[PDB]
Paper text:
The TRX domain harbours the conserved active site CXXC (C30-P31-H32-C33 in EcDsbA) that is featured in many proteins of the TRX superfamily.
The other three mutants, E37A, E24A and E24A/E37A/K58A, were crystallised in space groups P21, P212121 and P2, respectively, with four molecules per asymmetric unit. The E24A mutant lacked the water-coordinating carboxyl group of the glutamic acid, which abolished the hydrogen bonding with water w3 and caused additional water molecules (w1’, w2’ and w3’) to occupy the space filled by the glutamic acid side chain in the native structure. Overall, in the E24A and E37A structures, although water molecules w1, w2 and w3 were still present and coordinated to the remaining charged residues in the channel, the number of interactions stabilising these water molecules was reduced, with the E37A mutant also resulting in the water network being less tightly connected to the bulk water (bw1/bw2). Intriguingly, E24A yielded a rate constant of 2.24 ± 0.14 × 106 M−1 s −1, almost identical to the wildtype. These results indicated that E24A and K58A did influence DsbA oxidase activity, but its individual effect may be too small to be detected in this assay. Intriguingly, the effect of individual mutation E24A was undetectable in this in vivo assay.
Author numbering: 1 to 188
Write the structure that this text describes.
Amino acid sequence: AQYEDGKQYTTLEKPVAGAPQVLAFFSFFCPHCYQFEEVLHISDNVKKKLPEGVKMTKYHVNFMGGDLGKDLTQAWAVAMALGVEDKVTVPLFEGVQKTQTIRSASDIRDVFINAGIKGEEYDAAWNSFVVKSLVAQQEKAAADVQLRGVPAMFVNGKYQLNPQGMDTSNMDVFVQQYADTVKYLSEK
């Protein structure tokens, strides 16, 4: 065939039941994750090719960045809770990796303010039960897929994308191979 285990995807020994259809894990500290999002725009291109009524979910992981990382996982739950993921994704990547201006929890909050989320709305979401559930939820899903690093993407709890078996001499070719694989898996 064109698509094969070992090549564009591997198959989990231990499928995950009731996993989201397409589940991406990342870290604002991860250079490969910054490459996926700021240079390759993996997310956007995958979305463009997902079959009808097939949504993508994105979770932040903790095993990078120490205590700042844990705050970033909670700040991400804030973003998921308020629906502002597309407003803070770029300034958080750049604050962490490019300018290294995010050193503490208040620098994270500043980015949300400058993106239109008012400070009291952020604080309230930050200390809310919904955010606590979403932090726990991100952590559970990482554990359920025995996550060891990021970036990673899983389709229907069964298949793990294998970028390293894709062609990386042309970035645009890589991106369409990645996106097309995710489409192929959604329907497998």
